[PDB]
Amino acid sequence: ADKNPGSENMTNTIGPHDRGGSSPIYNILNSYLTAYNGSHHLYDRMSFLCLSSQNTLNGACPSSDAPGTATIDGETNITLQFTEKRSLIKRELQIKGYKQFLFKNANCPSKLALNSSHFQCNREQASGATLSLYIPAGELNKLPFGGVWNAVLKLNVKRRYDTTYGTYTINITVNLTDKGNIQIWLPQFKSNARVDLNLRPTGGGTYIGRNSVDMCFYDGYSTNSSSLEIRFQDDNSKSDGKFYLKKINDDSKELVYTLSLLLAGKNLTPTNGQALNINTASLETNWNRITAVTMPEISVPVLCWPGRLQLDAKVKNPEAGQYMGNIKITFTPSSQTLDNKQVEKNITVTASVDPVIDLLQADGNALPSAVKLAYSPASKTFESYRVMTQVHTNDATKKVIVKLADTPQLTDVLNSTVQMPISVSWGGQVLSTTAKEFEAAALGYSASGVNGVSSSQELVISAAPSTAGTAPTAGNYSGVVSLVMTLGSDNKQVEKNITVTASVDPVI
Ligand code: NA
């Protein structure tokens, strides 16, 4: 019926619309009645003015009375500022507006500019007016990226400038997704991401390593997504939450490692194949220059969630050599609205275990650092030191090269020129400064027992008077046996220094 003009508050929610397609026309108001009076012609001159002709905050368009009495036919162009909710980035879009006059006894539905003065229809003054506003086709394409874009259009409702009836405040929210561009972004790798665990030996066969991979999760929506679904899975599907690298030259041997995701504030502990569901309300974000996966283009930095994937490994006695595995990362940002697909990223993980070798007693106990040969005044001989040893190595397919660092001698502690030769033998072989080689096949390695532990080999350290048939000169004797053991082609080695002593009392 009749309607008196006044302030109105309205709301429009456009979308969700995807950047992947050109946007259609969106109606905001379609012939909305602003004023009508059937008995009097109070509202025959309704006009709508923006609050500025150039300032775009709440819409820029004519903000003052029209020049003459001549009506301005057509529509009004309004430049209106949109602000993305999370990023605060602004862009100006065009809104189209017009009004139409209502008459009691005739119809003249011409479209007029918002500030156009009145016109008579078949010689009769208008009785009221309606307002129309719309967003033209393609306008959404001007938004640089997905997010929640807000604008607040304000129009003053007036006769001429000195009369004010109120204000129309129209809140427009555009939910703009960009599903084609959701991605896990790794700043260091445009493709082929790789990390090495950087294993290092700490002792006792233990290897420890740690490394990290930076990654940003981007929802093609300015981080407006309420939750993230993130999964780390490793292509060694044996049901259990562990991650393994496999040895490159022997897929029966593995190396365990753990993942830890330091995500924009939150610390998570991914297990193999277990999807993490993370609330975003609490997560920090980051600007990054993430380009488009395919189309459409993203020409300006966007907001994403920054994370660091830390890999840790603490292993005991792994075989030597190169190891490799894969981590598949899948990610699905929450789009409550409709079926939001999964994206992925792969990371090749490698590690390297250094060839190592040690010589232990068969006991598993360390070789002494000092030995004392017992002397017999009756036979005038020294008792030999004998011990069963076993080589412990993490590369049991290699030769073992054994030698002495120098020709050892028992030297009189108080007389440099008085000396007895020390003889050393190992695994049934007399040693010298000239190396001898033991093939790995003849070392009796146990495929069934423990990896890299040799079968027993006898170490024998002996000494005897320099000249056969003669008695050792009385005194105290000392000398060093330096046993050096090397792997083959793996240029690593171990050196066991054994201090050898003996005492020959005087004849009396
Ligand atoms: Na009339």
Per-residue three-class SS string for 247-285: ECCEEEEEEEEEEEEEECCEEECCCCCCCEEEECCCCCC
Q: How far is the CA of 100 from the centre of ligand 1 (A)?
A: 18
Place of tokens 């897929």: 251
Task: Choose among 231, 235, 322, 239: nearest CA to 276.
Answer: 231
Q: What are phi and psi of 140, to 5 degrees?
A: -60, -30
* CA 74–ligand 1 middle distance (angstroms): 26
Ligand 1 midpoint to CA 500 (Å): 131
Give the CA angle between residues 444, 445, 450 to the nearest 5°. 140
Residue type, 398: K
Q: How far is the CA of 125 from the centre of ligand 1 (A)?
A: 7
DSSP letter assigned to residue 451: T
Distance in Å, CA 107 to ligand 1 centroid: 13
Dist. CA 117–CA 225, nearest whole Å: 47
* Experiment type: X-ray
Residue in the block written with tokens 């040969």: 373
Domains detected in the chain: 1-177 (2.60.40.2520), 178-356 (2.60.40.2040), 357-508 (2.60.40.2040)
Both structure tokens of 351: 């590690």
β-bridge mates for residue 500, sequence order: 371, 479
Give distance in angstroms: CA of 124 to centre of ligand 1: 6
Q: What H or E segment, with its residue span, contains residue 182?
A: none
Q: Please state, in angstroms and rounded to a whole number, the distance separating the CA atoms of residues 206 and 202.
A: 6
40 C-alpha to center of ligand 1: Å? 8
**Is 119:125 a contact under the CB 8 Å cutoff?**
no
Interacting residues of 102 by C-beta distance below 8 A, sequence separation 6+ = 36, 126, 127, 128, 129, 130
Residue type for 504, please? V
Angstrom distance (rounded) from CA 27 to CA 499: 97
Distance 38 CA to ligand 1 centre (A): 9
CB 216 within 8 A of CB 307: yes
Q: Are 151 and 82 in contact (CB under 8 A)?
A: yes
- Alpha carbon distances (Å) from 494 to 357, 376, 393, 401: 6, 34, 11, 10
User: CA separation (Å) from 389 to 367, 382, 432, 436?
Assistant: 8, 21, 18, 17
Give the CA count within 13 Å in the CB-facing half-sphere of 120. 5
Six-digit token pair at 499? 């201090």
User: Of the candidates 409, 418, 414, which has an alpha carbon nearest to the alpha carbon of residue 461?
Assistant: 409
Q: How far is the CA of 205 from the centre of ligand 1 (A)?
A: 104
Query: Checking DSSP bridges between strand 493-504 and strand 370-372, what pairing results, if any?
Result: parallel
Residues recorded for the chain: 508
Neighbours of 101 (CB within 10 A): 24
Q: State the distance from the centre of ligand 1 to the C-alpha of 106, rounded, in angstroms.
A: 10
DSSP conformation letters of 41-96: -TTSS-EEEESBSS--TT-BS--S--SSSS--BS-EEEEEEEEETTT--EEEEEEE
Rounded to the nearest whole angstrom, what is the distance from the C-alpha of residue 34 to the centroid of ligand 1?
20
Distance from the CA of 33 to the center of ligand 1, in angstroms? Answer: 20
Which SS3 state, helix, strand or coil, does residue 179 take?
helix
Place of tokens 């997560």: 283
